């Protein structure tokens, strides 16, 4: 089986200028003077969508700035110039010999100018809290870059064991990532305590940004 | 050109599903069609493809036992059965317009087939109550996926996000929150509107100052 390696796995690039993602098919995919080289764009929650045919023939619909490049086990994508809609997985594929196969992809994302996030916390609603169960809910809010790592502490002791984390994929508005920290505990756990803080460590800051409450 | 596949299902492990796939726009006589596996956040793996003025087929080793690829001429359609269903198959499967030589030009919408134990469970809603100002809502314990969120009816968009939900313990949570200015909260109303279709459950939840 064909083995696809695309490069890199993620790349940021501003408004206006060069994407270039390229694949390192392990072995030829050219038959009859013809590289069966695809690539394809996918957009969140949609199918993928055909950019390049043919190792540099357009889809249909697809403008220029797509462009494909490459022979025999070397190819190239290059978006130019990019624009606000392009960030999407992008995937090579080859069609030269069964099993057709896909390289693992590369995340293309806008780079725009750093962004601190908004921190937020919220203690346990007081409804939750008739279930016997508590979340501490942290939500960051419109940052950039995407790397940022959150820890909590109770009583300023770190706490690792039941936190779960969820991230939004870059807003096609602003550009910006957004990022949702909970902390779940029994109720009586909660209560024997009092100060909750939710810590970030973001480029924005060589300090970690703290939000916190005391359940006072 | 279209391709509209049928809904999505939740099964049981050891079930099959028939996945079908409705065409038109090109002549279907003459065309490749090919079935796709991609998992959440995964690249795409070929499964099968048939050639549908012969019905012939040729399937991905990976899969070969698992799926069966046919085609009603009569009608455009395409089908696949995909059978001995683990967990381990829940994806989204896609059917597309291509094989062979051919690059795959037309995609279908996409079908999530969830193969899974665990029964159907109604989502536990959360008021988070705290210039602006930011709201929240923690929608917890559910199964399946999809729940919806929206705020004041879906008429409240500006400054939401929702947030993917996380599988924790065999049942889902998900969270949302919504800034407003703190002139407009809570002098108007900020509400979590909060849908699950396979409970048939909705439900609302005004948030109010602690």
């Known amino acids: 089986q064909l083995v696809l390696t695309q490069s890199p796995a993620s790349l940021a690039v501003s408004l206006g200028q060069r994407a270039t993602i390229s694949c390192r098919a392990s072995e030829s995919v050219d038959n009859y003077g013809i590289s069966f080289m695809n690539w394809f764009q996918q957009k969140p929650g949609q199918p993928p969508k055909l950019l390049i045919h043919?190792?540099?023939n357009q889809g249909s619909g697809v403008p220029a700035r797509f462009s494909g490049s490459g022979s025999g086990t070397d190819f190239s994508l290059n978006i130019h110039p990019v624009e606000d809609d392009d960030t999407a997985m992008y995937f090579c594929?080859?069609?030269?010999?069964?099993?057709?196969?896909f390289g693992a992809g590369t995340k293309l994302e806008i780079k725009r100018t750093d962004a601190a996030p908004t921190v937020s916390i919220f203690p346990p609603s007081s409804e939750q809290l008739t279930s016997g169960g508590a979340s501490v809910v942290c939500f960051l809010n419109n940052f950039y870059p995407k790397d940022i790592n959150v820890k909590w502490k109770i009583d300023g002791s770190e706490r690792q064991n039941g936190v779960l984390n969820s991230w939004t994929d870059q807003d096609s508005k602003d550009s910006t990532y957004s990022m949702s920290s909970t902390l779940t505990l029994t109720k009586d756990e909660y209560e024997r305590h009092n100060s909750y803080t939710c810590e970030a460590t973001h480029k924005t800051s060589t300090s970690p940004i703290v939000k916190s409450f005391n359940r006072n | 050109v279209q391709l509209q596949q049928s809904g999505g299902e939740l099964v049981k492990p050891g079930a099959s599903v028939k996945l079908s796939c409705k065409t038109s726009?090109?002549?279907?006589?003459?065309?490749?069609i090919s079935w796709l596996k991609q998992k959440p956040g995964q690249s795409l793996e070929w499964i099968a493809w048939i050639y549908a003025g012969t019905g012939g087929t040729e399937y991905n080793q990976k899969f070969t036992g698992k799926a069966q690829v046919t085609v009603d001429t009569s009608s455009s359609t395409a089908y696949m059965q995909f059978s001995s269903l683990t967990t381990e198959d829940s994806a989204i499967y896609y059917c597309a317009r291509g094989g062979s030589s051919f690059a795959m030009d037309y995609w279908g919408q996409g079908t999530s087939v969830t193969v899974s134990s665990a029964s159907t469970t109604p989502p536990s809603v959360y008021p988070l109550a705290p210039s602006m100002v930011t709201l929240g809502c923690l929608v917890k314990g559910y199964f399946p996926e999809p729940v919806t969120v929206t705020w004041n009816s879906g008429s409240l968009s500006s400054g939401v996000h929702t947030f993917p939900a996380v599988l924790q313990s065999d049942l889902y949570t998900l969270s949302s929150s919504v800034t407003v200015p703190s002139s407009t909260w809570p002098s108007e109303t900020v509400t979590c509107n909060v849908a699950h279709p396979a409970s048939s459950t909705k439900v609302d939840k005004k948030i109010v100052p602690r």
């Open positions: 043919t190792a540099s």
């Open positions: 726009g090109f002549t279907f006589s003459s065309s490749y």
């Open positions: 594929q080859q069609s030269e010999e069964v099993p057709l196969t």
